[PDB]
């Protein structure tokens, strides 16, 4: 959205448990969801390659 995503409170995710509030959060621009980082800076470079 026009507002920055900078605050960390917007981002949270979960797996393996029922998430009606998250499944009802679909299509809405906020809150958006990002997983805990398995990514590392070396592996992150390879995706751009």
């Amino acid at each position: 959205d026009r507002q920055p995503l900078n605050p960390a409170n917007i981002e949270a995710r979960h797996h393996g448990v029922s998430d009606v509030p998250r499944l009802g959060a679909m299509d809405a621009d906020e809150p958006l969801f990002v997983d805990d980082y398995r990514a590392t800076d070396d592996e992150w470079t390879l995706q751009k390659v």
């Binding site: 920055p4 605050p7 809150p31």
Partner: protein, 285 residues
């Protein structure tokens, strides 16, 4: 000095006297927030004259207790001054995109003080937070307002929308209950946030906690006056309907102006000390 009543039964008197002693402990401090207390008056059950007297004893006693406990928030007000200085010192070490623009919001924040005149305090906290909440946006590089006349409304930053809904419920109770504040279980400090931002979020909550009390106290202290002033427009005309020494003696008791509560205190105690002579003016039982 204790409040007197006409035809009320002693059980109703116990319900009223307990309401005064527990008025601070009771949630939501408003007589209109407790309609059942108005039902204790016996309205419609008795004569139109008798209802006007018992209601006047309630509002004057509801008003005198507010004069007694006195919202002396100067102790908490000193904490706002300390947390205010704690924010600005953190920002000197952090570079901004325009240090001169940031320092202008710092120096005004460092000039904070509290004059003896209570009326300024509504503007003191407001002018300080506007110099504070805008400062938090600069480190986060979020856009600040540029249009003239469009100052940013105060609001907590970097909090979950569910979290803002929770803390607003706590400020909502202070507007209804300015006396016994109950501390929140959800602290505004966040490891994810910049440590300066956590100093700002607590600075806003200290500001909202004070501005809600000065605003709510400004209303209920004024709202009690208009409810009493109507009694002079009502009880006096009821005394005109019939002429007797008890009916005539009450007419001069109401001559004192309701305006200014210090003069209003004379309207109460003088009405109580002379209660024995005009007690027959109001029909009972």
């Amino acid at each position: 000095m204790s409040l007197q009543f006409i035809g009320l039964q002693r059980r109703d008197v116990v319900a009223l006297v307990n309401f005064l002693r527990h008025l601070t402990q009771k949630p939501d401090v408003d007589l209109e927030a407790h309609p059942k207390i108005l039902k204790k008056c016996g309205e419609k059950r008795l004569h139109r004259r008798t209802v006007l007297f018992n209601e006047l004893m309630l509002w004057l006693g509801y008003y005198r207790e507010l004069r007694f406990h006195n919202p002396d928030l100067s102790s908490v007000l000193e904490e706002f001054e300390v947390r205010c200085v704690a924010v600005a010192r953190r920002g000197y070490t952090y570079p901004f995109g325009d240090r001169g623009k940031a320092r202008d919001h710092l120096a005004v924040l460092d000039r904070t003080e509290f004059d003896t005149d209570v009326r300024h305090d509504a503007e003191i906290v407001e002018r300080a937070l506007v110099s504070a909440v805008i400062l938090a946006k600069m480190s986060v590089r979020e856009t600040l307002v540029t249009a003239i006349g469009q100052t940013e409304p105060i609001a907590f930053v970097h909090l979950k929308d569910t979290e803002v809904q929770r803390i607003e419920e706590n400020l909502e109770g202070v507007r209804r209950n300015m006396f016994c504040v109950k501390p929140l279980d959800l602290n505004l400090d966040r490891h994810a946030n910049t440590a300066l931002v956590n100093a700002v979020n607590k600075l806003v909550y200290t500001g909202r906690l004070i501005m809600n009390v000065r605003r709510s106290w400004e209303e209920l202290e004024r709202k009690c006056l208009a409810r009493i002033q109507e009694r002079c427009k009502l009880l006096v005309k009821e005394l005109r309907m019939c002429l007797s020494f008890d009916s005539n003696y009450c007419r001069n008791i109401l001559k004192h102006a309701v305006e200014n509560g210090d003069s209003a205190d004379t309207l109460l105690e003088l009405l109580i000390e002379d209660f024995d002579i005009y007690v027959d003016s109001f029909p009972q039982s």
